[PDB]
Ligand binder design. Structure first.
Ligand SMILES: Nc1ncnc2c1ncn2[C@@H]1O[C@H](COP(=O)(O)OP(=O)(O)OP(=O)(O)O)[C@@H](O)[C@H]1O
Ligand SMILES: [Mg+2]
Lengths: 485, 50, 152, 543, 49
DNA sequence: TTTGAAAAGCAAGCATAAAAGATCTAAACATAAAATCTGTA
DNA sequence: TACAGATTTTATGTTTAGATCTTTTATGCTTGCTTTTCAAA
């Protein structure tokens, strides 16, 4: 038969369509799912990425410092206690509950929740509480937002079903199955804002299963914002999530110090056998070298990060960047390759902090050609003349022509007018646009300095500055020629 | 086109290219029992060729 | 039937059939098929979350399409159908019954009647009345009071 | 309630529509015999009409085929006056494939969809006559590599006047790229409803130069040379030959109504003739007497209603200065139809004149102005005495005559629709008959008709409250409250009527129901989307 | 005339003819309407003088 | 034969309806691999 | 049981029909001044 179109790349998973409510003949016929081989969880790729080294690589003194500062809990004790007490009471009373946690990035939400469920699993290993199943659902790690329905049911039953069948199965399992035939499930919903669809059915279902009497379900919902339910969710879901919500504040600088010095307990103020032939250092031709990080360097890093964000990732990356700068300076002076006392002091931390804060924008427009800077200068002149923050391109063409023909006594303009309008030939006729007109316009568009409107008339098309006018004039004043006229 | 269709097209052209407030100054030709005045027309012609 | 755990709104008639069916399985995509199935016989359907039957982005008249069919067949002669539809007012002819938000005295009554199964009440009663008064109002949500006492 | 439903089916509970004439004293078998006479005459008309329809469709197919089959350009055909219902069938070329691709304006929203539908149709038809491909013009390129024979594509563009000419121009320029392949022949058919210049002003000049290389104009409309309308009118005259007469006013009504329709003339002519035949056989009691079998079933009512004839008036006045006499004058033939047949045959054959209207010729022959009709040709001056006929007057012709004096054809087929609405609303005595609420019916008009007179005398923008005040002043306050208190079984009505503003409230309720009735009818409109304070009148009477 | 595109509306798709908010315009050139007016011997050029 | 005087005409300014279209969505239309259902055997 | 075919389910792509919002342009209202026919003398 003749097809109107073809779908030759369809890849369909092997997932059944029959839900759990039809799996048994009656409610009384459902067995103990805890005593089932495939229920409640009762790494095939990790050998793929291995090879032989055939080399002994050099690990300098700063390498152990840089590995100790990677993201891969002295300051989270009240939040740990609250989350642990709520989850513990819900587990050992066979209750269903929702624990809401919100915060800015890198303040330790995921780490605290994972340590809470680790200590809960340790409690259930010694029979202080009934045994439970732990499930992680990250909303940013799903292809489709409905795949969470597929994931949780697969973690509960071992079945592979499609998403509507999975959510029917989960609805039947939480609602109708008796408690004595079930197990407690703790579900971490990480990145909750990613699980928000147009119709909020996933959020309603996940928080409404926690209001079922038989469910034995605990949902730990981790969100960006305290008032995410009030901003983006319905009143029923906001009622079901609750009024009691746990805020993870940004870290103060004493806590960022505590985190960094907890990362630097075993190598800060310690000795190394350095082997100055290669620089490969071994922790206790060969010298005993003390390594230290300055406490005031950690102080200024922690103070800057705690004022700006309180992010632990940012503080660890700042200290790691400082160690990288010190290691680059160290390997420059010896030529150690990769195959006394060395200190990560204040200035490395300051150079690491300022390299994220210095702007390349003014440096970028400084090193442009004459024609691009002439474009920017004419656009600034038109912006101050007619007061508009949006200028027609034909006006910019006429302004460039006017600035060339008015400042015709300038020596640079005398030297460059023939280049700008004839490419210095006297065989090319006089042009209506300058040489490299479309080039510098497209260059300022790729850089994001300019915005242009989608019109096909070139003269009446408008152009806007996407950067600050003060930055543009500061760039234009650095040039010797354009600051004169 | 028929007789009615051609005159409907002619009237549509007249409607599109003449202003409606000059209508009673042109086509009005019936006598009156009640006192009344028709539209005087355009006081001066425009030079735009509509 | 909770109406959120439904694929499309227009399948609700089919969802009414699968509750009341042993047997043959028919295709129901309109009010007419469910009517002619329920004509030769009474039937009571509680529809929780009636707001999910609204069709989004389909103009004001055609958005309420399925709900007019349900509430019209719910009044039709010589068919035997009682339709109870609960919904929520903050998230959105039949007889209308309103569940007003609870007052502090009603919340006190609910709290002591729920706590009656325990050997003792661990709260002071001015604490319970203070919690009830601080939780009641224009949003008398009992979930908020339960959360406040649990947090205490 | 099914009245609040959008659609519902009904299975109701459970021999001719012809009624008994002669003030209810007709025989029952006369009614049945009238029904069978109408059926045989109507069948004898429509067998000829459907044969004529088959003939015009076959001749149009043959002429289009002869144009289509008679280097690197299109074979372009412009069918002028085309309504795009013509079936086009192609010839079965040996070792070549011929495909017809039809394209409407709805199937042409852009060039991409036009090409995709064309290539799907081509691939489907070629595989039907003889692996998936991509529906683009490389299928035309690789056509002989898959199918082993060359290709002839005939594009039939229906409703060009409704198509986007930018899209059509770009599709033509896209098809021009297929001329570089040796095995491709492309023909284009343009069904044009207005004229060629209106479409040459809409294409590019390069497209006009492209289409001019091999093109043929062919003016085929329904109203072309009267070759088909005269056949249908001749079929009707052969049907009613020897039994019925056509008045000159009926024929001029046919001419006048046929002049107002251009694209669809023949269906209007058949509709008008059919409805006149229906009206005669439904109305006239002497329809039984159109055949000489039924001469033995005449009674006193027949003699009462045949004696009131103006031809009988003049005949007995001339005799001064009954059943046997009425029977005796059925043998005549009234050979005006045969004379018209002979004149048309003479003009078509001997004088080689085909551009004439037999309906106009019959109209002039009925009046007596056949020579003044024939004066337009300047070729019958030598044969006018041969071709002229004096109109013979036949007794009792009024009882066997298709005519429009009552205005029945005008009211039934082409009514002054909005004028009838306006006349009913303004007058209402000619609609509502004159005869509990008897005291109020003599004083108070129906609310729509009463409001329409105030509407007619108001200006183009009416203040709605002043309109209400005028409507309130038109009503009587005493009799309205008396009529609303005449029923004592309505407690809420009796409570409202004793309130002193009951007249104003009743007037407002009636006024507002009439105002939104007028809004649904289209008489008034509101000058806002949120206000209801000024109305504009959209309808003026007499237009 | 609306079918032959000799008369146009503001709305082109899903246009209801019966609304009082629907307006009407001619789309023929001046030469086409001049040919039409002279085919019925109507003097349209008096009206633009 | 005149004659003031009210109906009608024109302009500036501004609030506002309407047109055009940018952007998007639902639904009809279309295909398709896996699961599921008959259905004799 | 048991396998082959039919139907359904879930899933995704193609095209049409329609809603909503936004920006730009006609359209009419208000008010002050000026032309022009007209009911009366
Ligand atoms: N209290 C802490 N003690 C030690 N290390 C910490 C602490 N808080 C955060 N970190 C470090 O910072 C990293 C980021 O923490 P985590 O993943 O928990 O952040 P999060 O609050 O969930 O943020 P995001 O919203 O970006 O997901 C941790 O992996 C860990 O290395
Ligand atoms: Mg996290």
């Amino acid at each position: 038969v003749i097809r109107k179109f073809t779908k030759k790349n369809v890849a369909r998973a092997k997932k059944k369509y029959t839900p759990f409510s039809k799996r048994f003949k009656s409610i009384a016929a459902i067995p103990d799912l805890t005593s089932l081989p495939e229920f409640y969880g009762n790494s095939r790729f990790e050998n793929k990425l291995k090879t032989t080294q055939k080399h002994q690589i050099v690990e300098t003194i700063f390498s152990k410092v840089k590995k100790q500062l990677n993201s891969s809990l002295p300051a989270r004790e009240n939040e740990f206690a609250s989350i642990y007490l709520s989850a513990y009471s819900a587990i050992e009373s066979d209750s269903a509950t929702t624990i809401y946690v919100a915060g800015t990035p890198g303040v330790g939400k995921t780490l605290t929740v994972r340590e809470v469920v680790k200590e809960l699993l340790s409690s259930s290993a010694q029979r202080e509480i009934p045994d439970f199943l732990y499930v992680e659902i990250n909303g940013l790690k799903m292809v489709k937002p409905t795949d969470c329905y597929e994931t949780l049911w697969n973690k509960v039953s071992g079945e592979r079903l499609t998403w509507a069948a999975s959510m029917e199965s989960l609805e039947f399992y939480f609602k109708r199955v008796p408690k004595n035939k079930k197990k407690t499930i703790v579900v971490l919903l990480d990145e909750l804002d990613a699980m928000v669809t147009k119709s909020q059915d996933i959020m309603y279902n996940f928080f409404n299963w926690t209001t079922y009497e038989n469910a034995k379900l605990i949902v730990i919902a981790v969100a960006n914002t305290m008032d995410l339910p009030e901003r983006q969710l319905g009143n029923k879901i906001t009622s079901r999530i609750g009024f009691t919500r746990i805020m993870f504040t940004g870290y103060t600088h004493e806590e960022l110090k505590n985190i960094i010095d907890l990362r630097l307990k075993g190598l800060n103020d310690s000795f190394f056998y350095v082997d100055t032939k290669t620089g490969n250092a071994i922790l206790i031709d060969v010298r005993k070298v003390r390594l230290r990080m300055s406490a005031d360097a950690i102080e200024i890093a922690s103070r800057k990060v705690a004022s700006v964000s309180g992010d632990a990732r940012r503080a660890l990356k700042v200290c790691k960047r400082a160690a990288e700068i010190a290691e680059k300076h160290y390997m420059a002076k010896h030529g150690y390759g990769y195959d006394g006392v060395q200190t990560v002091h204040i200035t490395h931390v300051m150079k690491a902090l300022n390299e994220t804060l210095n702007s390349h924008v003014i440096t970028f427009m400084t090193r442009l050609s004459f024609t691009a800077k002439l474009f920017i200068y004419a656009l600034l002149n038109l912006m101050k003349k007619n007061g508009s923050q949006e200028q027609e391109l034909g006006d910019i063409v006429d302004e460039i022509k006017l600035l060339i023909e008015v400042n015709g006594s300038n020596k640079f303009v005398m030297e460059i007018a023939k280049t700008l309008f004839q490419q210095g030939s006297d065989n090319i006729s006089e042009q209506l646009r300058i040489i490299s007109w479309d080039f510098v316009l497209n260059q300022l568009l790729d850089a994001g300095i300019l915005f242009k409107q989608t019109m096909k008339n070139d003269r009446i098309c408008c152009v806007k500055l996407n950067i600050s006018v003060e930055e543009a004039k500061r760039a234009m004043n650095e040039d010797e020629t354009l600051r004169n006229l | 086109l028929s007789i009615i269709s051609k005159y409907l097209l002619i009237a549509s052209y007249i409607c599109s290219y003449l202003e409606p407030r000059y209508d009673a100054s042109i086509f009005s030709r019936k006598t009156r029992i009640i006192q009344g005045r028709a539209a005087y027309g355009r006081r001066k012609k425009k030079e735009v060729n509509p | 039937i909770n109406c959120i755990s439904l694929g499309e709104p227009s399948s609700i008639f089919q969802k009414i059939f699968d509750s009341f069916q042993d047997g043959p399985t028919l295709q129901i995509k309109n009010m007419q098929h469910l009517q002619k199935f329920l004509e030769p016989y009474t039937f009571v359907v509680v529809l929780d979350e009636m707001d999910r039957l609204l069709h989004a982005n389909t103009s004001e008249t055609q958005s309420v399409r399925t709900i007019l069919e349900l509430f019209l067949l719910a009044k039709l002669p010589t068919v035997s159908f009682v339709l109870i539809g609960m919904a929520n007012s903050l998230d959105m002819l039949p007889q209308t019954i309103v569940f007003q938000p609870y007052t502090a005295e009603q919340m006190y009554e609910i709290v002591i009647q729920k706590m009656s199964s325990l050997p003792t009440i661990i709260f002071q009663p001015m604490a319970i009345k203070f919690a009830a008064k601080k939780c009641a109002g224009n949003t008398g949500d009992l979930r908020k009071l339960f959360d406040v006492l649990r947090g205490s | 309630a099914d009245a609040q439903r959008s659609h519902y089916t009904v299975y109701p509970s459970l021999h001719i529509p012809f009624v008994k004439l002669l003030s209810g004293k007709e025989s029952e078998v006369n009614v049945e015999k009238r029904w069978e006479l109408y059926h045989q005459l109507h069948s004898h008309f429509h067998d000829q009409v459907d044969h004529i329809i088959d003939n015009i469709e076959a001749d149009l197919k043959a002429e289009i085929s002869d144009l289509l089959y008679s280097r690197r350009c299109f074979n372009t055909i412009f069918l002028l006056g085309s309504d795009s219902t013509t079936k086009i069938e192609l010839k079965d070329e040996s070792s070549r494939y011929n495909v017809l691709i039809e394209l409407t304006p709805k199937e042409s929203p852009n060039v991409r969809m036009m090409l995709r539908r064309s290539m799907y149709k081509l691939y489907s038809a070629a595989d039907a006559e003889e692996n998936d491909v991509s529906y683009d013009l490389s299928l035309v390129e690789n056509f002989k590599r898959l199918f082993g024979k060359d290709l002839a594509m005939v594009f039939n563009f229906k409703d060009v006047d409704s198509i986007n000419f930018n899209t059509l121009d770009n599709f033509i320029i896209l098809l021009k790229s297929a001329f570089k392949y040796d095995h491709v022949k492309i023909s284009l058919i343009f069904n044009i409803n207005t004229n060629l210049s209106n479409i040459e002003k809409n294409l590019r000049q390069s497209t006009i130069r492209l289409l001019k290389r091999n093109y043929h104009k062919l003016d085929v409309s329904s109203n072309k040379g009267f070759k088909y309308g005269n056949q249908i009118f001749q079929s009707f005259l052969d049907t009613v030959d020897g039994k019925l007469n056509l008045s000159d006013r009926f024929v001029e009504f046919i001419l006048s109504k046929m002049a107002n329709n251009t694209n669809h003339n023949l269906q209007l002519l058949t509709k008008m003739l059919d409805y006149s035949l229906m009206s005669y056989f439904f109305q006239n009691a002497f329809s039984v007497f159109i055949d000489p079998v039924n001469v033995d079933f005449l009674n006193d009512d027949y003699l009462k209603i045949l004696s009131r004839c103006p031809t009988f008036m003049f005949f007995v006045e001339g005799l001064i200065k009954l059943e046997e006499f009425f029977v005796e004058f059925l043998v005549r033939e009234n050979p005006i139809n045969g004379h018209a047949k002979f004149v048309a045959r003479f003009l078509e054959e001997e004088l080689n004149i085909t551009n004439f209207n037999l309906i106009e010729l019959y109209h002039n022959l009925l009046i007596g102005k056949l020579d003044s009709y024939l004066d337009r040709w300047s070729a019958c001056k030598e044969y006018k005495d041969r071709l002229h006929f004096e109109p013979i007057d036949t007794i009792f012709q009024e009882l066997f005559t298709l005519d429009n004096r009552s205005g029945l054809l005008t009211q039934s087929i082409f009514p002054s629709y909005k004028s009838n609405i306006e006349d009913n609303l303004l007058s209402w005595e000619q609609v509502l008959p004159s005869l509990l609420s008897g005291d109020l019916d003599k004083i108070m008009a129906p609310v729509l008709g009463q409001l329409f007179k105030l509407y007619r005398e108001a200006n183009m923008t009416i203040n709605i409250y002043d309109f209400y005040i005028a409507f309130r002043e038109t009503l009587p306050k005493e009799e309205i409250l008396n009529f609303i208190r005449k029923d004592p079984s309505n407690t809420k009505l009796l409570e409202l009527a004793e309130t002193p503003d009951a007249f104003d409230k009743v007037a407002l309720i009636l006024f507002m129901q009439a105002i939104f009735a007028f809004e649904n009818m289209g008489l008034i409109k509101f000058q806002s989307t949120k206000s209801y304070d000024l109305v504009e009148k959209c309808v003026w009477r007499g237009i | 005339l609306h079918t032959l595109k000799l008369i146009a509306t503001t709305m082109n798709k899903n246009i209801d003819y019966l609304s009082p908010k629907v307006r009407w315009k001619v789309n023929v050139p001046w030469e086409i309407i001049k040919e039409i007016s002279e085919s019925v011997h109507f003097n349209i050029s008096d009206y633009f003088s």
